[PDB]
Amino acid sequence: SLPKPILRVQPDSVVSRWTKVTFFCEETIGANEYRLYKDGKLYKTVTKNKKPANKAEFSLSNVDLSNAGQYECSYSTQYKSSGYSDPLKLVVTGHYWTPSLLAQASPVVTSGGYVTLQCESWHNDHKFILTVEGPQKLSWTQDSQYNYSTRKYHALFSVGPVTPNQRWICRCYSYDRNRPYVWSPPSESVELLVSGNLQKPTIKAEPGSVITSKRAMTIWCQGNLDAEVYFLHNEGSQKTQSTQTLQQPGNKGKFFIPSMTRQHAGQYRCYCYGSAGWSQPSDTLELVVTGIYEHYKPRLSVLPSPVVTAGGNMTLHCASDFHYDKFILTKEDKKFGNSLDTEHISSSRQYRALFIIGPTTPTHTGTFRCYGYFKNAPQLWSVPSDLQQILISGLSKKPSLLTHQGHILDPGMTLTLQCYSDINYDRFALHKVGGADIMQHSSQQTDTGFSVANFTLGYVSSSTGGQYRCYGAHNLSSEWSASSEPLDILITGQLPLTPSLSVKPNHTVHSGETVSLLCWSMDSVDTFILSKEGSAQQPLRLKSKSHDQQSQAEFSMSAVTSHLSGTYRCYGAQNSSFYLLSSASAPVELTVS
Ligand SMILES: *[C@@H]1O[C@H](CO)[C@@H](O[C@@H]2O[C@H](CO)[C@@H](O[C@@H]3O[C@H](CO)[C@@H](O)[C@H](O)[C@@H]3O)[C@H](O)[C@H]2NC(C)=O)[C@H](O)[C@H]1NC(C)=O
Ligand SMILES: *[C@@H]1O[C@H](CO)[C@@H](O)[C@H](O)[C@H]1NC(C)=O
């Protein structure tokens, strides 16, 4: 007879227990009386007098379980009651057991498609309803099925067709047949990610793609500014929702991780939703967590030398006593190369990995660290090995070494090595033959008009004796210069044997004489060495033939001069150790007129 009224509710039709709700009856015709019906029975009646208005209110303060049911509104003017508004289901939650909700495969879905969601609840004979948080409340009703293989009771829903214009947030409910108006508490907020058809977002991790465990990091998803909410997801499944993003400058979805654990590694992809619709997924960014398996640290060696010339073969050796599956090399803190299988060696009780690089390009100069990991956890790595640095020389002027503070040293003296060159190199490097450590320093500008590098070594010990080389390069240049001809550092006071010295001619010779001098030892000595106080030159090393049981060596001097004040001491050495000298000898001062 009259225009049918309209029924509105605030908030939405599904309300939790002990929460205030308000019905509104809407019309603009007349207001003689309003009637609220519950399940076809007169529940309440409101009269608009004793202040006249246009729309009626019904407050159900603190809703309980009995308030759930179908509600309708009617109104009367004069003496004519006008039909019924379309019914409205008021549902209340509680009393029951909370279900769980899972994506059977993944929430990723192509636009205009369907996804399968498994809801799980422990009630035997229950009907299940899957709903979405949207304007048009879409519902799905299914029965409980139990797979004999899985030995579990649960239902499945095919949601769709997933349109890219609407955001999809799914929630599951379970209810008894004979009590339909009372549902279970809502399950987890399961949101779907739609592979849209718009512009791709750029993804980054500013601390890096390889992070040691227990540390913090950030992930940025930037892109089209049509977006409102940003998401992150993994193939090893995660879902993270960021609705309010950093506005300056522009929509940049920031995600923060305070400490990396097992679940935080894997392949990440940013998804995006906006007013125009969903977007194509981002490129796959692999996040790696190291630090786990913090007991058996791997060890890294290099063959043949940590410094190689351009155009050679270089073998890196990553080994460990522990049964890892694969090893991976990292230049700087970034990736390089690829993974290789471990190899159980019978003799050395080791698990080995042999990384081949040939030829050696100047780009290989860097800081390599090898990690170990397993096949079933490709992103969970071991502890970084003690790093191995690599330098490559070849083409430029040789930077000769000053090698000051003498050529032979007794323990313990403070040794320094200065490295100079004609070309104004901005950076110098030092390395000992047969070693694994390399040293680098920035050159200072001297008064002469070129660059020199100051190198401070520690206490001269048994190990400091050997062969040393230096290299030079510019600030921008990645190619290093060929080394200088080798410096031989010698250590005395190491062998128990002690020689002595003599000369043949007179002490006060004229400046044109010849002077042969001799030092021998009754014990076995292979080579002998002559040393002068402050000898800037390399000392001469001579072979030993045994006259009697004593081992000796003559040092001849031809065309002597007064510039040579004299030769003072003699040392010994053997073929067993070419650079480790014996103790000092009796000094002998010479003079030349
Ligand atoms: C790097 O360290 C070296 C270490 O020798 C510095 O070399 C300096 O060289 C000059 C001469 O080339 C030395 O001067 C000397 O001073 C004494 C008196 O102190 C004098 O009797 C000598 O005739 C000579 O003039 C100087 O002592 C020496 N050491 C220092 C600390 O200056 C070099 O300057 C350092 N810096 C660079 C950029 O290489
Ligand atoms: C060249 O670059 C290195 C590395 O940043 C720096 O140590 C050095 O001060 C720079 N310039 C000079 C003149 O050494």
PDB file of N, CA and C in Angstrom, residues 26 54 88 129 135 176 193 219 243 249 264 282 296 307 346 371 380 389 400 459 489 508 529 540 559 568-569 590:
ATOM      1  N   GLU A  26      14.370   3.147   7.730  1.00  0.00           N
ATOM      2  CA  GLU A  26      14.516   4.301   6.853  1.00  0.00           C
ATOM      3  C   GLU A  26      13.314   4.424   5.928  1.00  0.00           C
ATOM      4  N   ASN A  54      12.151  11.410  10.883  1.00  0.00           N
ATOM      5  CA  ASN A  54      11.912  10.664   9.655  1.00  0.00           C
ATOM      6  C   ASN A  54      12.379   9.218   9.707  1.00  0.00           C
ATOM      7  N   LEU A  88      16.803  -9.498   7.223  1.00  0.00           N
ATOM      8  CA  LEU A  88      18.215  -9.281   7.519  1.00  0.00           C
ATOM      9  C   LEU A  88      18.655 -10.265   8.594  1.00  0.00           C
ATOM     10  N   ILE A 129      30.639 -21.909   6.077  1.00  0.00           N
ATOM     11  CA  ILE A 129      30.342 -20.743   5.256  1.00  0.00           C
ATOM     12  C   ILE A 129      31.615 -19.919   5.126  1.00  0.00           C
ATOM     13  N   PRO A 135      31.786  -4.941  -0.023  1.00  0.00           N
ATOM     14  CA  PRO A 135      30.428  -4.377  -0.065  1.00  0.00           C
ATOM     15  C   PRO A 135      29.379  -5.442  -0.339  1.00  0.00           C
ATOM     16  N   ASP A 176      26.139 -25.171  13.413  1.00  0.00           N
ATOM     17  CA  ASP A 176      25.274 -26.334  13.532  1.00  0.00           C
ATOM     18  C   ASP A 176      24.026 -26.156  12.675  1.00  0.00           C
ATOM     19  N   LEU A 193      46.056 -12.725  -2.927  1.00  0.00           N
ATOM     20  CA  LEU A 193      46.925 -11.881  -3.738  1.00  0.00           C
ATOM     21  C   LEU A 193      46.672 -12.195  -5.207  1.00  0.00           C
ATOM     22  N   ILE A 219      62.712  -4.056   3.676  1.00  0.00           N
ATOM     23  CA  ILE A 219      62.323  -4.400   2.315  1.00  0.00           C
ATOM     24  C   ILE A 219      61.424  -3.289   1.791  1.00  0.00           C
ATOM     25  N   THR A 243      48.921  -1.367   4.907  1.00  0.00           N
ATOM     26  CA  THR A 243      47.876  -0.505   4.371  1.00  0.00           C
ATOM     27  C   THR A 243      48.327   0.948   4.304  1.00  0.00           C
ATOM     28  N   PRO A 249      59.004   9.946  -0.413  1.00  0.00           N
ATOM     29  CA  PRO A 249      58.360  10.567  -1.574  1.00  0.00           C
ATOM     30  C   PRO A 249      57.541   9.576  -2.401  1.00  0.00           C
ATOM     31  N   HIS A 264      62.199 -16.270   7.711  1.00  0.00           N
ATOM     32  CA  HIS A 264      62.372 -15.000   7.020  1.00  0.00           C
ATOM     33  C   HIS A 264      63.203 -15.111   5.748  1.00  0.00           C
ATOM     34  N   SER A 282      56.259  -8.621  -8.660  1.00  0.00           N
ATOM     35  CA  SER A 282      57.621  -8.144  -8.816  1.00  0.00           C
ATOM     36  C   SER A 282      58.547  -9.303  -9.180  1.00  0.00           C
ATOM     37  N   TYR A 296      80.486 -25.617  13.011  1.00  0.00           N
ATOM     38  CA  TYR A 296      81.515 -26.050  12.067  1.00  0.00           C
ATOM     39  C   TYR A 296      81.713 -24.961  11.021  1.00  0.00           C
ATOM     40  N   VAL A 307      97.777 -13.966  -5.059  1.00  0.00           N
ATOM     41  CA  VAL A 307      98.057 -12.972  -6.088  1.00  0.00           C
ATOM     42  C   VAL A 307      98.510 -13.714  -7.335  1.00  0.00           C
ATOM     43  N   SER A 346      88.132 -39.508   1.409  1.00  0.00           N
ATOM     44  CA  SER A 346      88.368 -40.634   2.307  1.00  0.00           C
ATOM     45  C   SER A 346      89.532 -40.378   3.255  1.00  0.00           C
ATOM     46  N   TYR A 371      80.360 -20.053   2.025  1.00  0.00           N
ATOM     47  CA  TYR A 371      79.346 -20.530   2.953  1.00  0.00           C
ATOM     48  C   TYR A 371      78.907 -21.934   2.553  1.00  0.00           C
ATOM     49  N   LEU A 380      69.275 -21.182   3.845  1.00  0.00           N
ATOM     50  CA  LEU A 380      69.812 -21.238   5.202  1.00  0.00           C
ATOM     51  C   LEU A 380      71.275 -21.658   5.119  1.00  0.00           C
ATOM     52  N   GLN A 389      91.359 -12.827   0.612  1.00  0.00           N
ATOM     53  CA  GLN A 389      91.419 -11.720  -0.328  1.00  0.00           C
ATOM     54  C   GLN A 389      92.231 -12.117  -1.555  1.00  0.00           C
ATOM     55  N   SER A 400     109.178  -0.541  -6.986  1.00  0.00           N
ATOM     56  CA  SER A 400     110.278  -1.089  -6.208  1.00  0.00           C
ATOM     57  C   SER A 400     110.088  -0.804  -4.720  1.00  0.00           C
ATOM     58  N   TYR A 459     106.503  -7.284  15.831  1.00  0.00           N
ATOM     59  CA  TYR A 459     107.703  -7.935  16.339  1.00  0.00           C
ATOM     60  C   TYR A 459     108.274  -8.891  15.298  1.00  0.00           C
ATOM     61  N   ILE A 489     113.725 -11.086   3.022  1.00  0.00           N
ATOM     62  CA  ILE A 489     113.916 -10.746   4.426  1.00  0.00           C
ATOM     63  C   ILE A 489     114.465 -11.966   5.152  1.00  0.00           C
ATOM     64  N   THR A 508     144.944  -2.391   7.053  1.00  0.00           N
ATOM     65  CA  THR A 508     145.071  -1.058   6.463  1.00  0.00           C
ATOM     66  C   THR A 508     145.639  -1.201   5.053  1.00  0.00           C
ATOM     67  N   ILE A 529     126.828 -16.250   4.379  1.00  0.00           N
ATOM     68  CA  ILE A 529     126.366 -14.920   3.990  1.00  0.00           C
ATOM     69  C   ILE A 529     127.244 -13.877   4.670  1.00  0.00           C
ATOM     70  N   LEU A 540     125.685 -11.132  -0.404  1.00  0.00           N
ATOM     71  CA  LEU A 540     126.030 -12.255  -1.263  1.00  0.00           C
ATOM     72  C   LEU A 540     125.952 -13.557  -0.478  1.00  0.00           C
ATOM     73  N   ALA A 559     138.985  -4.978  -6.497  1.00  0.00           N
ATOM     74  CA  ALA A 559     138.983  -3.525  -6.664  1.00  0.00           C
ATOM     75  C   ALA A 559     138.279  -2.841  -5.489  1.00  0.00           C
ATOM     76  N   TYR A 568     131.689  -6.722   7.997  1.00  0.00           N
ATOM     77  CA  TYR A 568     131.747  -6.905   9.442  1.00  0.00           C
ATOM     78  C   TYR A 568     131.428  -8.324   9.895  1.00  0.00           C
ATOM     79  N   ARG A 569     130.277  -8.885   9.526  1.00  0.00           N
ATOM     80  CA  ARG A 569     129.850 -10.140  10.132  1.00  0.00           C
ATOM     81  C   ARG A 569     129.502 -11.182   9.076  1.00  0.00           C
ATOM     82  N   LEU A 590     137.440  -3.347   8.954  1.00  0.00           N
ATOM     83  CA  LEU A 590     138.455  -3.136   7.938  1.00  0.00           C
ATOM     84  C   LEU A 590     138.561  -1.654   7.611  1.00  0.00           C
TER      85      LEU A 590
END
